[PDB]
Amino acid sequence: PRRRVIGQRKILPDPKFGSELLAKFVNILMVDGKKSTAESIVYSALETLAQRSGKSELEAFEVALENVRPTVEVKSRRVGGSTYQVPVEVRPVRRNALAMRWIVEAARKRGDKSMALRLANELSDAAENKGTAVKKREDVHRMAEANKAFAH
Amino acid sequence: GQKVHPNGIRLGIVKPWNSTWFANTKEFADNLDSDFKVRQYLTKELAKASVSRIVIERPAKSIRVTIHTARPGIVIGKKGEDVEKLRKVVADIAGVPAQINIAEVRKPELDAKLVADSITSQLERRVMFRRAMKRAVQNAMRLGAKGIKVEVSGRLGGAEIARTEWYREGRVPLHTLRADIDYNTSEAHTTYGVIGVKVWIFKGEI
């Protein structure tokens, strides 16, 4: 905004892991204000993935997170009718936000029987670079790679 | 834009109500109907008596009406021969026994209703509106009023196009709630149509 007055709002930790990042993930996955459903879904998926992997929920989630997060994006800038695609860096908080949002949106578009199974399969795939989320990240990286001539 | 009623916004702060009775839902509409008829009647007869406000109160199964006037002698009559007949007619209208009190208005040029009625009468008698408005403002200000505003709108002077003109002196802070403002209006039926008159009078802070 024109004023630049806002600050930052406090977020509560997750119920049974003591982590803020999982709480943010649950919030991203919530619809209509039904938080209990979202937290149960994510807990079930994390448990299934930990069983099928063996490491834990925490660092498995983290490992999937480094494989999807971006490092540079583009912004439009109109000049004379067309637009420059200028590349700019991404702050780490925005990196986490974009990673989680891409993960959730990719998982929502699948043909499994339950949302927990969808999310677990997608995030296990993304842990080793096979899903649609990593494809979106690669596309963003490629598009930012092409237009570096305007990167001042 | 439009402005709020100066009387309505100060009823819980400085101005008091004109009706001070209590009733349930079954009596409320009838009480307002009877009050309307009583006020209309007393306005009808007492026109040449310069009455400002009529306060109606209902103690118990009866009624008490207090009229504020600037000519109490003509209202009272001869040793009270008029108050009794007015009381009897009010008792007939309202269906309960009645009692009537008279309150004298000192300095009748500081009451907005009286000034509005005077201006209306002068307009009816074919007097130039600027003349009357200036006299009203001077008369009000000479008696110690803190401010006065007088507005006249309509088909002034018999013109083909209507307009609005107003005069003001002193302070009239309409946005200050605690301030004491007396506001009242009047209508004049000239040979070309209606002319509206509004008066604001500012007296004191608290």
Binding site: - | H5, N7, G8, I9, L11, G12, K15, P16, W17, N18, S19, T20, W21, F22, T25, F28, A29, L32, D33, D35, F36
Partner: protein, 100 residues
């Protein structure tokens, strides 16, 4: 409104409160379950005899001053315009602008 409408309302009120008791008794006869269907038939045929204006449902609420048939409020007996007019002058006891 027109004076004709006010006259019609007055006449309807008169007929209604004149025939109230007879309407009540005939309706009570009809509404009973333990009776004779012949008596019910007679009561039905008798109920139609009365003038239509004796029904309380034939009356419309109207403003006590102007006669407007829309915007009525039962508490005061006036439509919105007249309620606001009177309320702004302090002629309705205890009523004031709300804010919460």
């Amino acid at each position: 409104a027109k004076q004709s409408m006010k006259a019609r309302e007055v006449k309807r009120v008169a007929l209604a409160d004149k025939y109230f008791a007879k309407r009540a008794e005939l309706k009570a006869i009809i509404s009973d379950v333990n009776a004779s269907d012949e008596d019910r038939w007679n009561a039905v045929l008798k109920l139609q005899t009365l003038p239509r204006d004796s029904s309380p449902s034939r009356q419309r609420n109207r403003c006590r001053q102007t006669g407007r048939p829309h915007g009525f409020l039962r508490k005061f007996g006036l439509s919105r315009i007249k309620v606001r007019e009177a309320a702004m002058r302090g002629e309705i006891p205890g009523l004031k602008k709300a804010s919460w």
